[PDB]
Amino acid sequence: LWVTVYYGVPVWKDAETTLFCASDNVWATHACVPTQEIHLENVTEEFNMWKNNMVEQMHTDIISLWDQSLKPCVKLTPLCVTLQCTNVTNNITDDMRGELKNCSFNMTTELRDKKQKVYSLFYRLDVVQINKEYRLINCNTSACTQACPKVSFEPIPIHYCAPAGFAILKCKDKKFNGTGPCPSVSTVQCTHGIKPVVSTQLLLNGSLAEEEVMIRSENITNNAKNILVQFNTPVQINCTRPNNNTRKSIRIGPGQAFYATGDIIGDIRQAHCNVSKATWNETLGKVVKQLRKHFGNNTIIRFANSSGGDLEVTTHSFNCGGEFFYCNTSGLFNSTWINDSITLPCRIKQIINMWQRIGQCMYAPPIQGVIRCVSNITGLILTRDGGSTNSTTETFRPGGGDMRDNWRSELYKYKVVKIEPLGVAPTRCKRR
Amino acid sequence: LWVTVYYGVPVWKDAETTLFCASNVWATHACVPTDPNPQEIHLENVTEEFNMWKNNMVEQMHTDIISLWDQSLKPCVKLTPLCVTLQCTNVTGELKNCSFNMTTELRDKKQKVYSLFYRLDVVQINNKEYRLINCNTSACTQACPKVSFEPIPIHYCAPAGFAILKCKDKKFNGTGPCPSVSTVQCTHGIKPVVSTQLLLNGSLAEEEVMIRSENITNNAKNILVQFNTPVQINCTRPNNNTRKSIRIGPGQAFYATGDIIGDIRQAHCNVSKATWNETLGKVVKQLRKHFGNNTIIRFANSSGGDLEVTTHSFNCGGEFFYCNTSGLFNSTWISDSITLPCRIKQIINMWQRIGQCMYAPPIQGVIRCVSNITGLILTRDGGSTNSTTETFRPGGGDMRDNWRSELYKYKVVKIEPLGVAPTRCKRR
Amino acid sequence: LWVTVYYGVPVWKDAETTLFCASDNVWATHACVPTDPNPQEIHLENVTEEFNMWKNNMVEQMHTDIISLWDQSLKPCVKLTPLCVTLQCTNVTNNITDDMRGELKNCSFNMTTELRDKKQKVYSLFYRLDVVQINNKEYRLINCNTSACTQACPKVSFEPIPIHYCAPAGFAILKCKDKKFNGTGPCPSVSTVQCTHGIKPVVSTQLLLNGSLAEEEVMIRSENITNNAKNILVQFNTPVQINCTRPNNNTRKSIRIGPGQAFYATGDIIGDIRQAHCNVSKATWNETLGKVVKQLRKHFGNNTIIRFANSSGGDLEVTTHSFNCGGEFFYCNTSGLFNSTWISNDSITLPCRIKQIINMWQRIGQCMYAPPIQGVIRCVSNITGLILTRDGGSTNSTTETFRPGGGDMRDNWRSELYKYKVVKIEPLGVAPTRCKRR
Amino acid sequence: VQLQESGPGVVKSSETLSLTCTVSGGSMGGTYWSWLRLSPGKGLEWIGYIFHTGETNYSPSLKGRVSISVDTSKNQFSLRLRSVTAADTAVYFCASLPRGQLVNAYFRNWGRGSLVSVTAASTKGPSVYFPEPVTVSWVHTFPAVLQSSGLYSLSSVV
Amino acid sequence: GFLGAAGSTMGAASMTLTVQARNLLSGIVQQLTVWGIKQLQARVLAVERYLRDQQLLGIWGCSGKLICCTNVPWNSSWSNRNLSEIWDNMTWLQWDKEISNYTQIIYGLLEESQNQQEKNEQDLLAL
Amino acid sequence: LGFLGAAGSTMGAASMTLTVQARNLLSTVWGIKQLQARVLAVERYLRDQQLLGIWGCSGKLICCTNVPWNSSWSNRNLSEIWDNMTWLQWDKEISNYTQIIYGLLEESQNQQEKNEQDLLAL
Amino acid sequence: GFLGAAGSTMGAASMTLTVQARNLLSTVWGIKQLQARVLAVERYLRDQQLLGIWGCSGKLICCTNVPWNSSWSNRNLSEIWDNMTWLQWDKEISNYTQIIYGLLEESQNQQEKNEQDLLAL
Amino acid sequence: YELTQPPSVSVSPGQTATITCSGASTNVCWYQVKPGQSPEVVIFENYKRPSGIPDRFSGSKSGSTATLTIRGTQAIDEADYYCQVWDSFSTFVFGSGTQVTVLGQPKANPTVTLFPPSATLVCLISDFYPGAVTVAWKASPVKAGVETTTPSKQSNNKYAASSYLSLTPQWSHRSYSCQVTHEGSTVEKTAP
């Protein structure tokens, strides 16, 4: 027998590479090229989604595309002024009392010589007391830029597509465990389009499971690892902010503007959000039905609210419409398992530092008008605690706060392999 | 009868690609040296069509000129604390004598510094209080004066695998299939001049005066007239300016206009009379072949709008003239010198962009440039078909029409050398 | 005979290319590629290659890379533009000894705070070489007549770390291996490497510090030894240990000047005010100077009277020995070392002195404010070189005077890149033989 | 590189002198910008230099009444002498030195030289004349003396 | 020169095919700003186009040659002219214009024919 | 089939579809990810083509060489290889013992070239 | 090693052509490394194209059909291939290379045109 | 240091003139100064010479005194020469200065007259060469309140000067005279 050379053999190895964007704004789709699938019969490929390299590259990409969008906007460095603030009581609701503060300060004008007396509205979570004289909360760590009004935070879908010489393997397993062997693997050019939403406790506008509710963890015995739940039937939610704000442009420099909240047209009420009752009960019943497989039969699985920490991790924080919400969600995780609607007391903050960074915030300008908003709840991020053994009772609390876990629920059926076309094999021929 | 495969044959199709430079603000040192005596071929049996209006070279040239200008304006000083209140009086009524408070290199001290400003770049705030007109729309950079604004010629070359063609037909109007197509390695010496309604320092025609349009029967598309003879235009700024340097802070300067040495006189750009009369006579003689052989052609003055589009604009030596040019386009044709009162502005919104200026510093001494007019950007004021008179007022304001005066005998194509053919031969 | 074409012949050619660096701070090595374990060195047996240490392009490439990395590492720190105002400085007088009197100034000035409309009144201790008088007396900083320059934010340290200069694909690096090399001329034993050894970019002006030693003798290198306008690099055989210290117990307090920017200022000194000592052993320096004099006589003569005198520079970087010791930039006298006349546990102390406003790469309008370091400061390093300069009186003389000098930082890295050359591989080649194509 | 001084020619006694040397066609990098003085009764002397970072070096005989400043923005440097006296009448040059060692360095790129005279007198007429030299025409004419009080005296004999 | 005798007959252009292929890669005289990134992208695009042109010649067994013959049938619906009225008095610019759609089937026919020919050559050498 | 449709098939069926994998190996500051990947693909393809060209094997897909098959690399018979095994398990088996084959072909081609050089001279 | 036969005889350095032939392929370190990698690809593709013009593609040692001129080198076989290195050969024939490159191009140009008419039978 | 030089050197044209600069440990450097012009360096080390300087200028050192040698003295080479060295305390020290004069036209004697006032005396000296001249007074010599015109070139190209003396209507003494000494020659003129 003599060795031969075959060029173009179908073998691959696992590797890491540079995945370029593709699309059908903050997320710069101008650079993305505009936008197929080949089934593979007799192959079984070992998958892993907690060691996946696509999620970290996607997270760094999302951070950098966020950072390049705030570059040409106004710095808002002169806004750090000694504010002078009082309450606002144009017929304020008793639950709303103390949240909104009228404020007035001295601001520089377009000319460098003169100055003007400007009034604005600020929430209680934005101003802090000087130790009535107040000041902004960002004047202590880092003064930060303002989000420009022309760009929008709407999550356009993007496709992550591999270059030449690589391939993306997609599982068609209908009951995929999240790791281990995959009986049916399909080779696609690239993904289905991922919406890069931002959330903390509940996943929004995600991809649904197609047959049953799947719960995936890196280690179900360990309590320090998060628990990702994927739904099969969506739960509808309503965003609501029932106020009519007026944006007035205050000019603080030669060609720079500071869009401040002017006044409220009418009554002020809380910016609640509504979820259905029976739909949530049926979905949570399916969830508590499945979790008894991993944890044991006749075990009392109950749900408590969030443990603590800062406001971002503890509260549900989404971005619908253009304002930043921070909702309570304590009427959602209360039950113990052996036409009503659950309303949630939500609150709005303006100075936002999103990607867990210090010294880099961003002022969100107010949006004129009333905001109506709906979305689907197609995923939860749970976290158990250190309960004692043989108690037959476990409490699950909504965790979150890490932005990798939102995009690990979409890139859970993908991997990147490096095709190598060279191989050797023996046969009967001999070179003449 | 079996397929053969041929490689390396000359076959091209039209495509778009990124070209590169070949040779101040326009970066000469970032270009490759030019290629010496680029020889020329002749396609004796070609009918390949050209297009002057929908080629991608003008868009790429416009983007490259804008990007080069923004790059060259980057490492210069920003005049953001110069925007203060100005107390101004009259000089000895166009020039203003403005005095202002202004910071020094020590952060707590201030100094009182006077300067001279033109009337076109100050506005009165509510009669001895003024401010610049950029103070509510921009905060804009002084061009640091080691750079120049000279239109050095720039050659465009094609990348490998792409070739740029060259039409050799003399009586070629810009659109349609020409009997003669050639090929060149690189374009000729295109100079990025800045102009409005008078194309100057450009390439002449071959024998007669061409008339180029999308359609001649529409009053929305410019008529790029190109001369066959040069019409020399030449002028000065008769004032004697002194430049003083005012320190704005820790190590940055601002060059202000000093006191006038001699006597103040307005700028004026004058052109020959008989030469302009015979050039306009050639234009009205040959232009009648498109609109009717018995027509009345009269030239009105400028239509209106901003000062950039109404007046002839050019950067003679660093100072930006805005000459009236209403004494030229004033005639009625039927089958010495002309002086032009001209005015100078300092803060400049160049490429029709709102939010960025540039502050042109004053220059010392008198300036003088002699230049040759090689083209016009006449537009047509349309009307009903009842009269034999046509009013052709000048127009402009679009910088692509300056660069569609050139890049007319050029087109880029993509070579595809692979090709199959039927043959009776066999591989064994 | 008949012509053949060979591909891959061992033929090189001298060329210049953009070398990339690898390593195992100011010099950001998080962007550099990790290097290999066990770097292969291939010895070329029957080869002689012409070398030149004064014309190789990798010295200027290294200088440009060090300038670029030092400029890049100062980008996200504090700008410190609103600091310099009309200072009001009186003399500090605490427990001051005989020396360092009138050197530290106690300055008081206004500053801005986090809020825009409020002010504060802070005080700092400034050295004499940073302040200049305008006309208690009114002083001001020396920098903001040309520029106001960035502070070095203290999470970035100035300790040198080794970088290995690799070679790109298609090129090669030839490494000299002769033990007696003056840097110019043919070399009998040439080896090739994938990357250089560990080169640490130390900054010094009179005495080369922390460098690579010799192996046999004290070599002396110059471009033209009969010319008196060329620097004479000396490479030591056995290193000479130098201990420099600052005995003042310094205190750093943080003054906040803006919404997110802090200016670290010198506070009150706890203890006594003393000058910065610098110790070199006398007997080791005497033996090393004897070795240098014995090696210097082979270029000039067997009876010339070699003398050493102190430096004759104009500014402070060429006159005085200058380096860093973990954050504080020293400027040291070194006139007790270069004072002898050589005919054919005692330690020398040097009055080292400290400056803060640093313009190091000699670019106009760029400087750096080095923050104070809390506590005492100590370094132990060894001298592995000198940068001398001959004082040429006339021809056929019998007395030569050598003075230290420097300022040009490319001579500090030409003493470590002398045994290296970059070449370009040309694999094509033709040769005649007897064979025929069919 | 060409240098040229500029400043007043007649300075009143016990005032502050001021001069400015402008550098044309060159840079401030690595060059000691010196000031030099040429008196007829005291020979050639040296005032001091300034390096581009502000490190100065004044003459020890004139230390305490001299100040040299650099300005890289307007491409020039200036000299200030305080408490001038009638023995300071000389011709003032601006020169340059290369960066390095001054053991063998020599002054180059000299200026044209501006004459500066420090006086202490007032306007008077000739008693047959400090601000204007008298013209005597009828012969032979002699140049005028300079007295210690600060006046002039000439003679004209046929 | 480049593209010389492009308007001549195919027989005259077949003797000068070796000068076009020298500079589909680059010239050597042309081997941080506006022009630098543009020139780098032009160089990368030229390299990719040259390698894409060479790979198709490599697959069909035509690598290393400028003129070659192959053993796949040609259907007469693609072209009807004989050899004499195409190889004289005809230019390639007129020749590419009608096979803009028939080409992609022909390329796959060449690919499968060369794969079958290589497998048949491999099968013969085992004896 | 498609781009990798013969990956699950056996060797005797996947060796007839070597064209489809070999054809698809060469198909605003953060648009540099598009530029960085293309040079990597070009360099990898050139490395594969050069390594084919060292063995005297370029220009063809199925390519035969006169280096004998050492039994230490694989002691199994040829009968079960080409109809009862896919290419992935073959890559798994000869992930080891590959670098010495890549040098044996390298030396054998130069030996064959020098033997051709000697035969064409007389 | 890599090029350890650079000082050896040309008759013994031709056994080892592969280990020099296989190492032509192998933010400050961003665009600089990009142009370095691109220019390495330029040099390798230029070399392989120059072998492609002469008709010696895929071959390390290629016999050709160009006459050797005695004016190029009067020095004969038994010392060029016995006691001389490749560097001295490159220094000797350094300014004669364009003529032999053009002659190889001409010989390969005339070689292929005499083959197309032969296969028309 | 002091860097002593001889005050005056006068030679015939076509001959050599040497000037010495003593007390110099460090390398000397010679500057050539002409009236109305900027100084030019002529010998920038002990022996070297910059470009543009003619071949007639050279220098050498022996011990601590360095000399400059001019090969041929023309009318161009009438100037003043200063030697310059470097010292550690004061960075640059210069010499006293030596004037080099050529003898283009031969020697003649001065002409002097004395006039009484109507009290200041006037003593004008005309038509002498070379310009080295000294003026003396007596009453018993006079050593106070005397001022002397520095010698200047008139339209004759032949040097002339003047002297003045301030007195009180001391016009006690019986004899006044103005003494001029011209390189050895003495002319005396005298009175109430």
Ligand SMILES: *[C@@H]1O[C@H](CO)[C@@H](O)[C@H](O)[C@H]1NC(C)=O
């Ligand atoms: C030019 O205008 C006429 C008048 O409407 C129109 O019929 C013609 O289509 C226009 N030309 C083009 C190219 O559209």
Ligand SMILES: *[C@@H]1O[C@H](CO)[C@@H](O)[C@H](O)[C@H]1NC(C)=O
């Ligand atoms: C017009 O004048 C310019 C400058 O004087 C000159 O370069 C150009 O050639 C002239 N045009 C002609 C002569 O057609």
